[PDB]
Design a binder for this molecule. Structure first.
Ligand code: HEM
Ligand code: HEM
Ligand code: KMJ
Ligand code: KMJ
Ligand code: H4B
Ligand code: H4B
Ligand code: ZN
Lengths: 407, 411
């Protein structure tokens, strides 16, 4: 019940007791582990508020204080009358930073306490939403010296008045299918690129066309807005050694900014809460460029390197994969845009685990997602046992709006 | 109840009913996932239900469920248990059991081969010397001059856990590891503890970097005894690189036959505590883990040096670069010497095909994603994108504690 996790590269053992404050469910049982499955009212709301407020006031060392019981009473009262309640700004910031702290799949959480929270709960319209998101983007980008941020739009009420950003990220390239066969641009975004045109977008039909924002306020029809190009920092991808690399015409955007998740604090649901930080190198080079259901450029890069592509045992895919990722990091670093390589980030996370066990009693972690998609075992997280459990406040997935909107 | 797994690269979706025939626990609960944790004397009482479950399965596979042969075998096993407190497996049942234990190994990516296992019944064995002979014939047969064949040799089952057969080596063939007084390690750092045991048991250690360890064999619960595998039976491959002539000068070699010998085979409630098994290598087992783990030979540095790489900042990905060439070299050497080996792209693709076939003909295929995904280039292999259900079927291979921690010494 006071569990241990071993690191097998160093024999360091940590005792996890934070897990006993777990709440939500894992999807697993004693008969079946689902650790690799991608996606498993007034009476319920007050215990949720209490749990949150109790830990908020513990963190500020006012557990069982006048201000504690008074806030408990105050929120209790507001729930009894309004059937919801509003977070004090301080609680909003704590709840947001801790939803990140608890993101068991995020390798970048050593930064968790430095999150910039932008309270957009006064927002009423998609134009307003657009204004906030432009401000988010410019602040986060910071001329390439990226800064973590989240912008929190009004909380759900009756599910009919939801605020949603329909894009999965604030900044993504469009996906166009071809009359002759495959796909131009980003295949992952092909359907969304439809719903943009199919909602009135005029596509440049290029390969790296920044998608427009599709913002939904108070449950209304969503609206298209183009992010000012001067706010969208991009890096052209070149190699420090192969001058033919530039001719592939590759570039990526500097700001990863997840916009389609749901943030839960003390029972309240924030359906629009775009958050952002900075890329780990492999997200772009391994996944964005080389996944088969993505830009899948491996075949062409290896040809340009004149590698024996006839048998898998030459490991030509592996060789190319390493070059592509050397180039991504090389390009971001050259243009002074923040980026972290997977060796540095996983090492940082080990340090961060150390600290969370030491000052919090544990750190929920999803090995299937922490371990980078290349060179796994030469990173320290590979040999690190992790315990996965759902703490709250949290980010959670939510249905794609086009399936849901009472249109 | 039915359960669905999806492949996020191809949208193929599969329906698992086989998890319904699941027994032993996972370690997980609805509130904790232990999916990445490495490690998650039996009476007449619980034994016959375990036997009956196994015999039921066995007779279903041969399409004789409820037959007179089936019913008489149950009755015979039942009476043998109450009479003798255990029972013996027929040859046919032992073969089925071992094949299905492999088939059920949810961490094994090589399971497409599961039905082709060569089973060696060593249940008539009684002494360590007899164990040595059986193991020598396993190594000769499985090796096959480089054209490797999968095999398992099954020694007598446990009785009161005071008379266990155990192979004390973790693998039949493994290199020695020596801790030096200066703190560095000569040879394989994984094998230092076992090497000391051998040295203390009387092994004359050549104290080289690639010394094949002696077999340390325990029969019927007696003290273990040392034996040297004849060197002409140990097939080895010198590691060279197809473009880098300096690679041969690193002096590296590896043995050809991976043969796991410290696990426990469970069949119908019987426990076979010595059951060495062997197949052939995936290239990354040697090139990524054996050479490049920090707690192993750790040749990344010296390969990086000789390649002349920017070793100053990790964001040059010099480690990744060196790792790929080392794995190119392992595959190249083994193919050049016509020793069976599989690269990780080939093996993951085969597993996916195996896995789908298992869903269609069996209703599922338990799989441990954490272990199935290769330790390099994970996402460019198809298992990365494969959702997988993990659960425990029997027959099974289980871990067991190292015998030197439990054995009671005679003298
Ligand atoms: C600052 C540097 C950051 C780095 C390097 C980083 C890195 C990563 C990586 C590699 C993943 C795996 C997802 C994938 O591969 O598609 C991930 C997931 C995630 N990140 Fe972080 N991230 C950072 C910042 C943030 C911030 C600021 C937040 C929120 C405040 C956040 C929340 C999450 C969540 C919730 C997930 C997992 C969502 C899920 O369950 O799918 N991250 N991150
Ligand atoms: C024939 C080709 C085979 C290949 C390519 C192969 C490959 C692998 C690999 C790469 C692992 C991961 C273990 C690690 O990386 O440390 C593994 C695990 C395993 N393999 Fe296979 N294997 C093969 C044959 C066999 C055979 C013949 C058996 C038994 C009859 C077997 C039983 C197992 C078991 C029980 C595990 C579980 C390991 C554990 O839980 O620690 N394998 N295999
Ligand atoms: C803030 C941030 C930092 C970073 N460095 N990187 C990312 C992108 C990784 C990511 C984070 C996340 F929270 C959700 C998704 C959606 C994918 C879910 N799966 C179904 C594919 C993501 F891609 C986000
Ligand atoms: C039959 C076989 C084929 C293959 N191609 N490769 C191997 C070696 C991989 C392996 C398989 C196994 F069943 C147990 C261990 C010991 C590791 C135990 N850990 C807990 C430290 C292994 F290394 C075995
Ligand atoms: C902590 C973690 O479970 C441990 O390092 C595991 C991870 N996955 C693995 N996968 C394989 N194939 N082999 C291993 O030794 C391991 N080790
Ligand atoms: C099937 C499996 O769950 C799926 O491929 C997961 C595996 N691990 C991952 N890890 C990261 N970081 N990102 C991902 O999208 C995934 N996908
Ligand atoms: Zn689990």
């Amino acid at each position: 019940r006071f569990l241990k996790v071993k690191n097998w590269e160093t024999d360091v053992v940590l005792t996890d007791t934070l897990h006993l404050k777990s709440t939500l469910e894992t999807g697993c049982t004693e008969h079946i582990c689902m650790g690799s499955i991608m996606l498993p009212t007034k009476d319920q709301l007050f215990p949720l508020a209490k749990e949150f407020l109790d830990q908020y006031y513990s963190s500020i060392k006012r557990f069982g204080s006048k201000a504690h019981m008074d806030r408990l009473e105050e929120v209790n009262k507001e729930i009894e009358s309004t059937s919801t309640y509003q977070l004090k700004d301080t609680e909003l910031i704590y709840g947001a930073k801790h939803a990140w702290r608890n993101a068991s799949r995020c390798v970048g959480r050593i930064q968790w306490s430095k999150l910039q929270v932008f309270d957009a709960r006064d927002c009423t319209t998609a134009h307003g939403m657009f204004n906030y998101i432009c401000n988010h983007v410019k602040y986060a980008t910071n001329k390439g010296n990226l800064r973590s941020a989240i912008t929190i739009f009004p909380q759900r009420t009756d599910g009919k008045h939801d605020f949603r950003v329909w894009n999965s990220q604030l900044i993504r390239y469009a996906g166009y299918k071809q009359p002759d066969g495959s796909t131009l641009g980003d295949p992952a975004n092909v359907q969304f690129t439809e719903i943009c045109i199919q909602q009135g977008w005029k596509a440049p039909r290029g390969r790296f066309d920044v998608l427009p924002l599709l913002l939904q306020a108070n449950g209304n029809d969503p609206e298209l807005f183009q992010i000012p190009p001067e706010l969208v920092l991009e890096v052209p991808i070149r190699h420090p050694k192969f001058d033919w690399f530039k001719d592939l015409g590759l570039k990526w955007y500097g700001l990863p900014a997840v916009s389609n998740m749901l943030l839960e604090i003390g029972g309240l649901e924030f359906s629009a809460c775009p958050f952002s930080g900075w890329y780990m190198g492999t997200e772009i080079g391994v996944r964005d460029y080389c996944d088969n259901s993505r830009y899948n450029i491996l075949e062409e890069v290896a040809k340009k390197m004149d590698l024996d592509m006839r048998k898998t045992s030459s490991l030509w895919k592996d060789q190319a994969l390493v070059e592509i990722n050397i180039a991504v990091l090389y390009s971001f670093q050259s243009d002074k845009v923040t980026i972290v390589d997977h060796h540095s980030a996983t090492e940082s996370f080990i340090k961060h685990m150390e600290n969370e066990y030491r000052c919090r009693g544990g750190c929920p972690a999803d090995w299937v997602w922490i371990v980078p998609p290349m060179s796994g075992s030469i990173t320290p997280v590979f040999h690190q046992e992790m315990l996965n459990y759902r703490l709250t406040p949290s980010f959670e997935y939510q249905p794609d709006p086009w399936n849901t909107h009472v249109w």
